[PDB]
C-alpha cells in the first residue's frame, strides 16, 4: 500500500557520473508506472520485454533502478546489444533485458558556465563491462607493453574523461539523466 | 587478419623528404600503438618511434628526433613516418610494428628507402 | 639510453648443439611490482622481418618451438637453443620494454657448423 520512492531516485539533485553509476533495490511497496510513461517529462522512455502501457497491472520478485549522468548522444548506447564507449567500458544491458530505459535533459541543473569537470566518463578499459558491472577504478591505462608505476607519460594515461557540460553546448553533447528500471525473494513490488 | 602493410621500395632525391605508409587491417586502429624501426643493410635494428592513433602521442629516439615525424589518418588506418634532410646514411629498410597483447608481434615487410639523384 | 650488450656477436655451431646467447643491459629490467623482467628476444632470418620469441624474459609465444628458452633477471639475461636445427639460422636480438626510449641489441648471428 506504500508507494515506491521513486522520486528520490528520479528527482535526485545530484546523479552519478556512468562509470560510478548508482543502484537503489525497489522492494515491498506499490509502484505505478503508467504515471512516469504520462509524466511525458521524459525525452525517453523504452521498455524492452514489456509494454508501458501495460506494465501498470504486474508484480516483479526484484526491481533494481540504475540512475546515471551520460551526453545525449550516448543514450542510444543505454540500450540492448549496443556498443561504444559508455556500452563497452561504463553501463552495460543484457541482450535478455526486461526492463525500462527513462531519459531527459539536465543541462539546467548539470551544466555550468566555465563547465562542469563532476560528470566523468571512462574512455579507456582492457575489457568491456559484462552486463550490470561497475568499475569506479581511477588506475593509469597502459596501452603499451611498457610499465607506468602509477605516473603518466607515453602508454600510460589517465583512463576518466569529462564531459565539462557547458550551457551554449548542442543538444547531443548537453547533459542527460537517465534511469533504468530493471525486473525480473517473492514479488514485492505489485502494480495496481 | 591483423595485416600491417609498407610499400616495398622508396627512391628519393637527396636533400628532399620522404614520408612512408603503415596501412593497417584487422583491429581497432586506436586501441593499438605502432613503432618504426630501422635495420641498415647487413646490421642490427634501430627503434625511431611510437605513435598512439587515439592521441597521436609520440615518443622518439634522440638520434631520430628532428629527423623523423611520426603522424596518423584514423579514417584510413594508416600510420605515417616522415623523415628529412635525407642522406646515403637514411638508405636502409624501414619497419613498422604493432605493440599488441605482448611487445611487437605484428610488423610490416618493410620499406627500403635508396637516396639517389 | 638503456644499452644492451650481446656477446658472441656471432656463434657457429653444430646441429644437435645447445646455444646460450647473451645480453646484458645497463639497468635492471626488473619491474618490483609484478616481479617480471622487461626485456624479449626476436628471431630475424634471412630476407624476412623480426618475429618474437619471448616476451617477460622467459614467457615463449604460441607457435615457437620448445627448444627456445629464456632466462635471466636484472641486467643479465641468456637466450637458450637446446638441441639447435639447421633452421634456427638467423640473427638474434633483445629488446627492452622497460623504459622508452625502447632499445635492442647489436644481434648474434647463429651460423651452423658442418
Known amino acids: 500500500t506504500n508507494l515506491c520512492p521513486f522520486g528520490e531516485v528520479f528527482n535526485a539533485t545530484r546523479f552519478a557520473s556512468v562509470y560510478a553509476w548508482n543502484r537503489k533495490r525497489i522492494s515491498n511497496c506499490v509502484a505505478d508506472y503508467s504515471v512516469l510513461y504520462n509524466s511525458a517529462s521524459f525525452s525517453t522512455f523504452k521498455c524492452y520485454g514489456v509494454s508501458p502501457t501495460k506494465l501498470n497491472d504486474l508484480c516483479f520478485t526484484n526491481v533494481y533502478a540504475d540512475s546515471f549522468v551520460i551526453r545525449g548522444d550516448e543514450v542510444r548506447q543505454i540500450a540492448p546489444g549496443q556498443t561504444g564507449n559508455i556500452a563497452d567500458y561504463n553501463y552495460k544491458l543484457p541482450d535478455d533485458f526486461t526492463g525500462c530505459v527513462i531519459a531527459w535533459n539536465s543541462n539546467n541543473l548539470d551544466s555550468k558556465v566555465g563547465g562542469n569537470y563532476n560528470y566523468l566518463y571512462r574512455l579507456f578499459r582492457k575489457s568491456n563491462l559484462k552486463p550490470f558491472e561497475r568499475d569506479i577504478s581511477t588506475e593509469i591505462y597502459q596501452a603499451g607493453s611498457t610499465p607506468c608505476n602509477g605516473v603518466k607519460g607515453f602508454n600510460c594515461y589517465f583512463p576518466l574523461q569529462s564531459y565539462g557540460f557547458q550551457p551554449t553546448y548542442g543538444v547531443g553533447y548537453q547533459p542527460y539523466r537517465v534511469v533504468v528500471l530493471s525486473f525480473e525473494a517473492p514479488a514485492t513490488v505489485c502494480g495496481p | 587478419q591483423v595485416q600491417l602493410q609498407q610499400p616495398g621500395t622508396e627512391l628519393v632525391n637527396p636533400g628532399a623528404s620522404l614520408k612512408m605508409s603503415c596501412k593497417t587491417s584487422?583491429?581497432?586502429?586506436?586501441?593499438?600503438?605502432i613503432h618504426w624501426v630501422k635495420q641498415t643493410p647487413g646490421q642490427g635494428l634501430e627503434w625511431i618511434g611510437a605513435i598512439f592513433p587515439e592521441n597521436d602521442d609520440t615518443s622518439y629516439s634522440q638520434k631520430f628526433k628532428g629527423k623523423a615525424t611520426l603522424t596518423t589518418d584514423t579514417s584510413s588506418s594508416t600510420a605515417y613516418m616522415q623523415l628529412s634532410s635525407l642522406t646515403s646514411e637514411d638508405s636502409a629498410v624501414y619497419y613498422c610494428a604493432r605493440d599488441g597483447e605482448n611487445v611487437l608481434d605484428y610488423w610490416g615487410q618493410g620499406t627500403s628507402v635508396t637516396v639517389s639523384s | 639510453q638503456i644499452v644492451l650488450t650481446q656477446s658472441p656477436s656471432s656463434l657457429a655451431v653444430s646441429v644437435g648443439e645447445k646455444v646460450t646467447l647473451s645480453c646484458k643491459s645497463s639497468?635492471?629490467?626488473?619491474?618490483?611490482?609484478?616481479?617480471?623482467?622487461?626485456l624479449a628476444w626476436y628471431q630475424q632470418k634471412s630476407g624476412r622481418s623480426p618475429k618474437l620469441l619471448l616476451h617477460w624474459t622467459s614467457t615463449r609465444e604460441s607457435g615457437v618451438p620448445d627448444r627456445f628458452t629464456g632466462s635471466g633477471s636484472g641486467t643479465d639475461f641468456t637466450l637458450t637453443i637446446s638441441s639447435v636445427k639447421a633452421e634456427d639460422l638467423a640473427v638474434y636480438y633483445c629488446?627492452?620494454?622497460?623504459?622508452?626510449?625502447?632499445?635492442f641489441g647489436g644481434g648474434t648471428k647463429l651460423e651452423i657448423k658442418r
Open positions: 584487422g583491429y581497432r586502429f586506436t586501441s593499438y600503438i
Open positions: 629488446q627492452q620494454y622497460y623504459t622508452y626510449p625502447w632499445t
Open positions: 639497468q635492471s629490467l626488473l619491474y618490483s611490482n609484478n616481479q617480471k623482467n622487461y
